[PDB]
Write a protein that binds this ligand. Structure first.
Ligand code: ADE
Ligand code: ADE
Ligand code: ADE
Ligand code: ADE
Ligand code: CA
Ligand code: CA
Ligand code: CA
Ligand code: CA
Ligand code: MN
Ligand code: MN
Ligand code: MN
Ligand code: MN
Lengths: 232, 232, 232, 232
């Protein structure tokens, strides 16, 4: 079982498994049931931006998701990730569809991690490439040539597939914490466009950090968001 | 009365005015009595590093101060600075001595602020100059040519003066928050060397943010750290 | 007489004063007649991006201007700016109109300077503010609230004024070179939209570096681009 | 045959194979015989810093190497790397010893590449780790726990081995050029300590860029610097 820490943009309420009963953003620490959630008005067909911010000092993992009309959800959760993550992780984006579906389109992704006492990794993808050799693609995720990362299967005619799951992880392992670093901080930002014409968009996109070998857990579509093998 | 938000490295306990009764780092929101403090073992003659981290999402202003042997104090305080600071501020470093004294030597200072929806300001001074035209010097603060910023008066023979106060503020106003920014974050880092041979080092160094016109408040040496006119 | 180094996006040929006889980008070292120019197809009403790159090692000041259809002009000029600029400068953007006119609209501006042996200044304005306290506005230049910097006068009805000149300089002096720095580098980027319906767009926008007190030289509209008092 | 572009800090004159007949820094484009060299006074046992700067606009690859007493060599070479490198490369550091030997100790390494029209990769290693999962180590190169990268074999007693070669490449492929990028720039910086007590230090350290699969070419010690299979 991979270790996962994730911010999820959860477009579909599986109130079954402790989602709230609206779309939400949530902070997931080793479980798809978020330790914390905030109501989130997904704007179908609109390009949102999620920011994810943590530092080892404040020990508060925060996320905001907003859209251009300014509507914003925020969630923060106090957690010492040193006690959750392995020292080295990969960072990634993950998305799933289920019985309902949506595009899970990432227009851009950036990430920074810093260990200060400085080691640092920053990458930014404002355009994705067809053969993006720094991105590890999993499940239905593809990139290129519209400059996008399609986390889940879209069809030839621009149509969000159901029953879909994919992720992209930055190629280089990140050293997310180092026990002598006085500050270990990361931030990530991604811009996304979730569009659906279905009866309910589902299921969402997550930014995640995981052990360096993480892969899509089996049957992790719809509600499990490609991050966890199950709903515990 | 200037508006001040500050992280203070407070080397001397004025338990009189609610210091704890040890040296401490503290978070000051509009008052020299810190909303929050942490015990701090000042290492005389050793070069410490303070990091200060805030973002409008987590709304938690955090500071750590460490030294090379790894000893560290941290303090964090939950505060929405949008409700404390003016939209535009200057950022600065401040230090004072009183009846006791110390060097308040800044070897480096860096700062970053970002407003994302990005506007950003980053500066870094790993060496200060004699005529440092981007730094507004106040009170006893001088820079150049040892590459240092002497926040307070030192004497020709390397001797920390008593009864001393100075600050350096970055020349450009910073736009610390902007009501449409989805994330307003700042961080600052400075490295310092507080040395004294006196009976007690005093009084400390602060990183502060203030209205753009802030100046040293009158008689703000020793305990008031050059930040506030008084101890309320 | 201010010292000026500039990259000019020169929309109008004053073949009179050694412009080439097409619009051009040029590198200006202390003179409006560029030491170097490249043909430039200004795309009326289109948002272009200029990048300006120099480092004290290669001693080559380079500029490219491009537009989204990919059309690009480049100009580079080998120059040791240590021998041209004062150690401290301000950096700015400048634009003018003459008998012909255009919008000189800056949508974004970023700048970085670094002195390594590191001191560094980076700012980025992806949105300008009405009361932009880190930007020194000169001549007709205004900012806010469309998020733009209007270097020259526009009229209430969106109309580019003739006979116009303005600039914006970053508030903080920059330390552009330091004789012990092993590398002194800067880069700047700005995005602009030059639009005109006139018979000929004129006259252009420049990014410039100048002594810290630089102001618009008298009658520096049209061809002189707000940078020089005359055409020598 | 790997494609290599490298800046070499060449401590030993193999005037045999067109080294100049002093230690030098050189720019290597697909050949160990530098297209360009500059005399370089290696300071035995002193910690030098090399900066490497290229951008697709100026098309000038520049390097300076300096030491703290200020002594500096520079070399620049005009080259359009788009025509030399594959679109995706790895970036690395390489070092060798021969009949003579030296420490090839890297204290820090940073790299940035940017494709603007922005994609970007920046990493910085100011401390290396024992199990540095973002660094691909080759030949004798080891890292950890003194915080250093030992490109070549050192012996238990701090002794630079002869006949040694190693490299470290950043784990993630870098996208060094992209035919729509208006500016493709990179820079790299590393700090190193070359120490020897031998009759002549040899042979040097290079920063290099190569195809993503590059490995040490066979018998690439001493003069070939771990970069090329031979001296053509
Ligand atoms: N509404 C729902 N809640 C929880 N789990 C589900 N799996 C499928 N539909 C679900
Ligand atoms: N110990 C102390 N506590 C508080 N204020 C003081 N002013 C001078 N000495 C002091
Ligand atoms: N065509 C032109 N060339 C040079 N200077 C000018 N001033 C006005 N028009 C001009
Ligand atoms: N001096 C030298 N010059 C060139 N190649 C060599 N190989 C070994 N020694 C050499
Ligand atoms: Ca769900
Ligand atoms: Ca005190
Ligand atoms: Ca002209
Ligand atoms: Ca050699
Ligand atoms: Mn959920
Ligand atoms: Mn205190
Ligand atoms: Mn011209
Ligand atoms: Mn050589």
């Amino acid at each position: 079982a991979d270790t996962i820490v994730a911010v999820e943009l959860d477009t579909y309420p599986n109130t079954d498994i402790g989602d709230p009963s609206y779309p939400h953003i949530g902070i997931d620490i080793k479980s798809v049931r978020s330790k914390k959630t905030a109501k989130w008005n997904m704007q179908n067909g609109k390009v949102g931006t999620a920011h994810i911010i943590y530092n080892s000092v404040g020990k508060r993992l925060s996320a905001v998701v907003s859209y251009p009309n300014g509507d914003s959800a925020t969630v923060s959760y106090d957690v010492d990730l040193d006690n959750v993550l392995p020292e080295w992780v990969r960072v990634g984006l993950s998305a799933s569809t289920g019985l309902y579906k949506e595009t899970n389109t990432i227009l851009s992704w950036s990430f920074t991690s810093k260990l200060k006492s400085t080691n640092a990794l920053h990458f930014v993808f404002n355009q994705f490439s067809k053969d993006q050799k720094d991105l590890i693609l999993q499940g239905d995720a593809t990139t290129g040539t519209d400059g996008n990362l399609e986390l889940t299967r879209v069809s030839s005619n621009g149509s969000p597939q159901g029953s879909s799951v994919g992720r992209a992880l930055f190629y280089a392992p990140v050293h997310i914490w180092e026990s002598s670093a006085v500050v270990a901080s990361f931030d990530a930002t991604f811009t996304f466009l979730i569009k659906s014409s279905d009866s309910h968009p589902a299921d969402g996109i997550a930014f995640f950090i995981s052990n360096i070998d993480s892969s899509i857990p089996s049957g992790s579509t719809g509600r499990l968001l490609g991050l966890f093998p199950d709903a515990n």
